[model samples]
Target: DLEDNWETLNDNLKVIEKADNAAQVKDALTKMRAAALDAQKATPPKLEDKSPDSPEMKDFRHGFDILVGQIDDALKLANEGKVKEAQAAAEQLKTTRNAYIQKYLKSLAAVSSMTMFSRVLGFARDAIVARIFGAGMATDAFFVAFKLPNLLRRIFAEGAFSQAFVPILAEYKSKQGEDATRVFVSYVSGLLTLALAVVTVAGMLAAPWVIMVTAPGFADTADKFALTSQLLKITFPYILLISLASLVGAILNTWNRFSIPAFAPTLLNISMIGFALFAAPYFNPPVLALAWAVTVGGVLQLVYQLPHLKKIGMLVLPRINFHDAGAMRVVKQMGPAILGVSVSQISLIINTIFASFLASGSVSWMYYADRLMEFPSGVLGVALGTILLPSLSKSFASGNHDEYNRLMDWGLRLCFLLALPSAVALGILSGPLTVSLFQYGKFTAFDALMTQRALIAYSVGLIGLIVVKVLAPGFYSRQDIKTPVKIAIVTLILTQLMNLAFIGPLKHAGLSLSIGLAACLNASLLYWQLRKQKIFTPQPGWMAFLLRLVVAVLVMSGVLLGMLHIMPEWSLGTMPWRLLRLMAVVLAGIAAYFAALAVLGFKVKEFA
Candidate 1:
């Protein structure tokens, strides 16, 4: 409670100071003291079970009813110049619902489970890619080249469309009926198809600049840059196909059928793995073949989703319908939200571009470390955020503040709880984990250490990254975008400054840390702004949770620090023993952290 109060109080002071209101500052100080006093005396937020008509339940109901209506009024509110109220309403709903929402949002666990399996397989493929490619000119060229299109893919393709498309489509079906909605969908589809065609051509034409920008560190070496540009042309068309595939997937998800489209991405990694195993060795410049395989698999991915999409009755061609209210509404809502929600990825691309200007293999190092870091990241963070966002979006659209707030609370707490230990474990054990996983074939101990350093940096911001994903969507889900954009731009500035500071000295590891620190800054601003407006109703236990997490992380760090001291010869070793020791350390930390939380009155499996 002290921690949560302090976090809130500190943010309040900052905001008040910035507001330049001395009276408010004094009032804020008094409120801060009251919060502190409460923290000193009050019990942590506890789970209370009550019938719907109970006062506690009524508070929940009233708050939620307002929240659901908030979403309904969001677009209207946006046009009426009450953007702050609209955003606050959305944020309020998100915070209120953060408590009980996870139980009902159990599909997250399932998705994460499947994603974990996919990640494991991905790890296997990465291990082999490392052995075979070793961040050489070819691999470096190919990886950066591929990322260029993927950057577009994230921004304009699946990532962008999914955010913008789903809400409006869902609303149309509800208000205007199915036939009108279907016609709207076909129009959007036609527009999307045309847009993707232009994007594909642009990509083909821009391959040289794409390669150069993504890997400028290799620019002095013309052969490497040239090879990369060539590969970009082959692979960039994938953006068009995959984006369309994503639209199909979004339609399916809106219709409540998730398995097929969710499963489509697995095919991409699988195909890449197949290429690395069977096809790469047989050809010189095999990475190009790998690139070709990506293009082929993308086509297959589109094909695979079509049947499922058809099953959901979304398989028709789109007609032009620029004046369709639903289409215009989506455009209005999505345009700003796209910029707001996608800042992290945008920051990532900026960092990548800067890395390209840094050194050979810098981008590759960032990529490899990112792959490892993303394992826990993708499974827990992305999985949980994906489930929560739409729920909050719908609730906010319908004006259900109680459910929105409850969902946000539950999501953030669960993210912290799940991510806390992993952050500690990974930050402490990065070296051993890296070596055990990747020190093979051409992957040297030095490479592992560098990668581990990168992982540690990522660990610093893992919570930040996950939290931003979870929290920012609270804004976007409500169709509020400007705050997130402001926050993102601020974060980008901070990240660039850090990049200059670190990249010059730390190289690859420095680059990774820069990105991490940027994430931390972005996340802090997000939460600070959110709390200022009273959008989220954090649990009383959140303070204790934060304290326990920090202490447990400290304890875990100590354990690792002690273990390193005891071992004395903690260099890379055989993969099995190294992996075992790392796992043992992780298990020990988990046991200790869980036990500490239990002692601190944390229920096992509480929110998450």
Candidate 2:
């Protein structure tokens, strides 16, 4: 059984191993199989037959509560430097909770990936647009217009609002009636639509100011400002449309009608590609076509989901009702979340503003570095958090806060496993990955190097980024947005201070550092607040897990640092060859890390 499990573990491990490490990685890998001397050596307990919501389920819930208490004590022991005691406690708890971990893993394995279909086609559209208009005024203008609404969409529609709205609304749907759910959705929709219309119009009217503030480099350029305003007018409705789609999407997610709605991002990808291929030439500046396509696609996505929303009985034309208690509750929770989320988004915009003041392709450099950063943040961290939030909120709502704590730790571990490797890879592969993807077209080798440097700086915070993304949900799941708000305020302040300190020396890299530092502060603050509230505790074994990880990462870093010194002497004549050599160094570092980890008695599957 152990061998079978470890064999399965190796299959997943092989996915990230680069070619240069194949020999050392394989050599260090262990395969241990357990044998049963007889075919029927032991009898398994008969599985209890319980209804989906039954007394046994309640007992199971209580068991999780007990586990949470144990974990709390274990964490205290860890904090007191009783490391062995904590590790033992944690191992015991993990052994007991292995079933839960396996269940989550199985569920994750069952998930269908729409990100590839969406992001690839989406990137193709972006690349076409980039080639048509490489870091020019019009392209800059269009990006500004498009990004304004998107920032808000992430802040209000997707980030905090989605977190706060879902569980509370789901509760109303379950307890009160469909009418209550419908009423809540309608009023919230109206409020959001009205709010979006105002922001959209204001954005359009303030386009020149917005462009000036966001991309100050464009101020001396004449037509860019007017074009930005025009584009803002045309595309700004997307805010309302996508916000509506998000509200409906949240309802659908709560109802478990996931596939079609989960697939809605593809619609935007399809629309952008169509515009880039066929509509660019007709527009004076080709990228305007892409901007227009964004608006059209938002409409299409919103319209498409309405049918799904109706089938699920959530599609209702909204009316203004600020006085409604459910609507007000959401609005109240949303206010602080929007502040927290928007402050972070604003810092990103500030980075762009700073980048704009640099050379022509500086914005592009920042963009590429951001894309690399988002890979892990989006794929593993956000995706898993989406799965965990509802489960967590359900646990909390049912008064099974123990399950909440257990799931929180599980989420953290999963996040660390996925994100740590990614951080290490991206930091090492920053140059290689940047050059591999964007070195062609009008983009230059110098641009790639600059972007890669920024990327390395950005990747330094990947762990913090993933941790914040994972940990924020802990508070959000408990219907506590205030904690994030408080922490986010402090984070925003620290980010600005860092931005001022770093931007002068490192240029775009400074901006990346500022963002990452802010994220680290955000995650750390959330962990502290949650701990103070007694919402969750890090598991017993987690300190050992972390120490082992640090040892592995440090060993890897040393190997890569050494390789960096010698890489240029290897006669890498072409960009591809240079990238391969750099990547090879990274692979060596990874091999050293994992080999050390395995030797130290860590299981490949245990981290997962």
Candidate 3:
């Protein structure tokens, strides 16, 4: 298999090297990548030491690793039709094909950059989905089917265990040494596998009940109900696949290996895009292609992690041992984190149930809206959260109170500074963005308008969603889940209460508004608790900071609103024309935002 993959890689590399257009290069590059996956499993003949832990072998993998990233960067560029730039990046694959590799070429920026690439493609994927599938009974059914796994993924894959496991793992390795750390990791890995298998089976088996409970309104229409259940059965396995990937990712991040996990989600986007473009034609319902895409994308994400895990020497066989104290402790701590997350996820279930009762396309509209919000939230919130946890863990473990506070404060400031602007842009440009991206093919201007409405509501809470990412870690770093859990429970109650009030007036937008409001309330409670516990002390300069942010946001909104007043037609014209107009408005806002900040004397070193 390895030999076959290696040969495949060689063939594609040759084709890619000689390809002129982005289309040809992209096609060959995907083949090269498909072949390269297995190629990573075995060593090349150039290295004498064959052990994965060997230094040369490690660098060999490193070169191969970032080469994947480099190719991915080129692929995205190609996907966007940037033929000239794609060729330049593809050339690197040949020139330095075999050389000494640098380990972790960049840290936070790399994570952000890779994350940005994925989120951009994520947009392309959604735009394509909206165009090809459109918002209707079929697309709505797929969205509901896909949401369970995605929400679970949000809760766990990107959620709690890492917040719980990493700190413990760091402490174990810190004082208990590598041998014991490896033991705990192995046991935890096994037990998690066993647990995940049971859960996955139960989910698949209970797909009908799951869909019925999650989207009851679909039941009145038996076809939609059964279709959703079928889609769920195909998609549900993504939970197990991605969570395991999350575990390996947790291990990697704990070891300060950020690039792999950071780069992993792009493949998921790639998978969905590939399926939407190519494979959908073959599936019976065609929507089935998206479900399979989710599962296969998850598989690819998991497979990508193994080579690096072995390189870190932390990869171990899963060993289920009930008597393992360290592993049990990690499990115990996760329960609280998971429960806390459940409170938030419950909001999602309730929203789906609510949206299910609405018109056919409501589910898909909000889902696409949610996708737009995630671009900023993921790139800012998740990226920062992943990076912050280990750093905060180490600082807490070492009793570096000052470092912990600075890191926490740094996260808060950065979250506010970046997230505030992102929120504004999304809210201000919702119509333009929605129309530009989704109003094509079967997706109508009406569907884009509906999505835009939900986006505007969701954007209100965007800061809260992101800041919570920064604030929650302060408690988690200290190994405190109870307080945040309590706060989440409170926030959940309040969110549902608002849902009841807003649903009458706002409809589906109300569900979005309720979540946004609750997110803000949740963020406020988190901030208060951090201050209350004296765990996070706000650094100096807040009065000036608030003023600067206030002024900058106002100026930015003015620029966006002014452009709209002068040239307001977003739904008319060709895709490129709409995209260019949206870009112009967004760019003007960003320029005005920074200009106001600069004039207010905002400095990079203030947060630093």
Candidate 4:
């Protein structure tokens, strides 16, 4: 049938070229139209389902319509006996064809780009703090102090609240209209404000007790303990302010306004940078200025989103309404989400618990490795997840389960394509990546190597880490939060157990590996549950696509590692020199990876 399709199309086109008159050309074009109409009934072998109604078949039909439309226009021109105009009008088809393909890629490109800027600023501010503050009692007090609110900040804002809020928030917006969305925000925002307000007030009043409970080591030194409690009060209100910032982000993200919210988090880094650069000396303890930096940033972040909200006409005043069903609906959903986030945080505490038992630099090494992982995971995973949740929810809300599954498949395919190569390069270039970026001043060669070992373990799970960000939304978007929470509990359990065996044998690197392996477990289980529940179906061609991706990654690894061997040892260089060499190697690896993909016939259009 496919063979018969092309021959008629080919025969008619050739006959058109040889036609002696417009009437003959018209007859030939008539046959070509007949062929496309029939061919549109068939499926592309490249697609998985091969059903006539499958996405690929619809794409084929759309293309058929476009070509036939163009063919009709060209025939109309040819009937006028204007051969040049007919040909020129036919050529515009290529331009229109390219214009229609974009859907998901640019959204991700822009969000991730903005997120990348924020993460870079975070790194810059962190480096500035360490350089100026050094390892002393004041710095220690401030980190512990800062750590208190940041933990709650993650639990309330970026981690649980956004996921819980945005899915249902879109649920209403798509269901009712602005009236539904506005009231939900007013009630939910009010609910969030009061809930966090109590916590912030309680946190400030009990700052001293909170420090002693969270950090017993600080109790041994009077000045350290006092300073930490003092800083915590200043930083603790950040929880209320930043949680509101996250609320605005959900509002904006639900409205399909992405850039401002994604970039708003950058103010956190900006405020810290400014304070550490200029305002630190103004404060008596200096570290106190750093704590206030966070509070200042939280204020900046929340208000910055307000103007954008006003422009969208979504800027509503928060009114306390305990009776609102939409607000309570979000509250109930957030319950499990909050617990799920806490599960991860508990697992984190266990990592610190174990790390504290080991060598002095163990915590620093793990922290450094985590910092390295965040660049890709933040840029790729968080940015991708940020967009996918709202998008998936909207699709589910619109009753397009097929498109929702296709979105999942596309997100997964994109993740594997981008993440696998990154993981490989990170592992192959771990030492150089560690050395070039760190291994300067107080961070010694030994420290970088220690950090490198942890980074290697993180690289092992890099794909899984990114994939979870892609996969978990399959459950979350459906208002099925419990499955992910239940799975995380098991993964968390297994991770701590792995820590038991590995920490004894591998030390600090063991802790990193456990987290990485558990991430793989979490991603795998979520992928399974999504399939089991029929929430997500695998699109066709994934096997062939993944096989090609693996081969491309292997080829890129060889190019990177081979290039590294010819370069001087990392010990022989300064930070500037080593980082420069790393630039050449990273570029070559990226070039080789994409070049191999091109050779293997990978194209964005296939997935898009």
Highest lDDT against the true fold, candidate: 3
Error of 2 at 297 (Å): 1.9
* lDDT tens readout by residue for model 4, 1-608: 43377566666665665557767766766666677678666443333223457454576678768867877887788878876666465456445445532221244445534555677788777667655663346765676666668788788888877657767876676567768777777887777888899999999998887765676654445576688789989999998998888788777865654677888778988999898879977998888888889899889998888987887878877877765664668777677668778877777656655654566556667777877888887666655654455466556766667888887788888788878888878988999887777655656678778888999888868889888877765665565367777898999889999999999888989989998888888889989988888777789988888899889999999999899999888767765787788889989999999889989997644222
A best-first ranking of the candidates according to their TM-score comes to: 3, 1, 4, 2
lDDT (Cα, tens digit) per residue for candidate 1, span 1-608: 43465365457545444533335444444454455345433212121212235343444444435434544554344445554544444344345345532223244335423556677777877887887776566767778777877877777665556567866776786788888877788778777777778888987887677655555666676677778877888898898889888888777765644566778777887888888778887877777877887898799889988876666577867675564653675567567657655675766677777776755666676678888887887666656654565556556666666777887787787777777778777887777677777777777777777777788877877877888887776665544346777887887888888888897778778878877777778888988888887777665667766887677667666777777666533444666677777777767777877777777666865322
What's the TM-score of every candidate structure?
Answer: 0.74, 0.71, 0.74, 0.73
Model 4 compared with the native: what TM-score?
0.73
Model 1: per-residue Cα lDDT at residue 164:
72
RMSD values for the candidates in order, in angstroms, are: 15.5, 12.5, 13.4, 7.3
lDDT of candidates 1 onward, in order: 0.68, 0.66, 0.78, 0.74
- Encode model 3's per-residue lDDT on 379-420: one tens digit a residue: 675556545554565577667668888877777777778878
Model 1 ranges with Cα > 4 A deviation: 1-105, 108-114, 180-182, 318-334, 338-346, 382-417, 477-481, 536-548, 563-578, 605-608
Error of 4 at 451 (Å): 2.8
lDDT of 2 by residue, 376-449 (tens): 66676546654555456556766666777788887777667667776877787676666665655666667678
Taking the candidates one at a time, how many backbone clashes does each contain? Answer: 34, 0, 0, 1
User: Model 2, which residues run further than 4 Å from truth?
Assistant: 1-51, 54-114, 179-187, 319-346, 382-418, 473-481, 528-547, 554-593, 605-608
- Deviation in angstroms for 289 in model 2? 1.5
